Design a protein around this ligand. Structure first.
Ligand SMILES: C[C@H](C[C@@H](C[C@H](C[C@@H](C[C@@H](CCN1CCCC1=O)N1CCCC1=O)N1CCCC1=O)N1CCCC1=O)N1CCCC1=O)N1CCCC1=O
Ligand SMILES: Nc1ncnc2c1ncn2CCNC(=O)c1nc([C@@H]2CCCN2C(=O)OCc2ccccc2)[nH]c(=O)c1O
Ligand SMILES: [Mn+2]
Ligand SMILES: [Mn+2]
Length: 179
């Protein structure tokens, strides 16, 4: 295998690793080759799941982690349930409390840079955007951060723990440059 793949398997829990493998193979990418994107898929997955964990019991409909056609099935149902507009791109969550889809981003640049790319690419206006970084920074639409401070602070801490673990294994440099 590879050093990055070995690190991913001992860093994330097996359920996350399995969902990342499925999501990567579903789009023609092999986790054993594109190991940097393998780490980023695991990171993005865990962040979405910690995010959904931060709300109430039945607040978030998780979209990420499902297969493509079932994910769009849940989106069509949410749209016909509440009446919100069907987004052009697959989001990560839906907030039943605020009635909006959420796109979650985990970047290795300025949260402003990645927000600008995502906000211009989405072009749906209704989809709420929330970006985390590997340095503790976050940016969200209308400065509305959805969750309480304690839940967001846990995610940031986890991201920085992943960053330190990669550097100890001298993997962080190629990982930050691969994005
Ligand atoms: C035991 C516990 C594991 C976590 C798992 C949970 C993520 C997520 C799990 C899967 C369900 C699998 N599939 C396959 C298709 C149908 C389907 O449903 N997916 C992915 C798509 C949506 C979904 O449901 N789920 C399940 C319940 C709610 C949820 O979000 N979460 C949430 C926090 C971080 C994390 O990983 N659980 C289970 C419930 C409580 C909990 O925390 N562990 C092990 C040690 C650490 C830990 O937390
Ligand atoms: N190569 C593919 N690997 C898995 N899933 C893929 C994929 N191509 C498409 N999908 C499914 C639909 N896209 C997303 O869900 C999605 N995309 C994006 C960005 C922004 C523009 C395109 N993009 C992209 O290429 O994915 C990057 C990526 C990598 C790991 C984990 C999540 C995302 N950032 C999201 O935070 C996100 O959730
Ligand atoms: Mn997604
Ligand atoms: Mn996302």
């Amino acid at each position: 295998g590879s050093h990055m793949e070995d690190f991913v398997r001992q860093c994330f829990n097996p359920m996350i690793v399995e969902l990342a493998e499925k999501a990567m193979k579903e789009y023609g990418e092999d986790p054993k080759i594109e190991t940097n994107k393998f780490a980023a898929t695991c990171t993005h997955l865990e962040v979405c799941f910690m995010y959904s964990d931060g709300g109430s019991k039945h607040r978030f409909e998780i979209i990420e982690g499902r297969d493509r056609i079932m994910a769009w099935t849940v989106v069509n149902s949410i749209c016909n349930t509440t009446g919100v507009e069907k987004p052009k791109f697959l989001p990560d969550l839906y907030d039943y409390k605020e009635n909006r889809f959420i796109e979650i981003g985990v970047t290795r640049r300025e949260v402003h840079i990645y927000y600008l790319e995502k906000a211009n690419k989405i072009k749906s206006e209704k989809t709420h955007i929330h970006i985390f970084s590997f340095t503790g920074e976050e940016m969200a639409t209308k400065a509305d951060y959805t969750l309480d401070e304690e839940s967001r602070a846990r995610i940031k801490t986890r991201l920085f723990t992943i960053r330190q673990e990669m550097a100890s294994r001298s993997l962080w440099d190629s990982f930050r440059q691969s994005e």
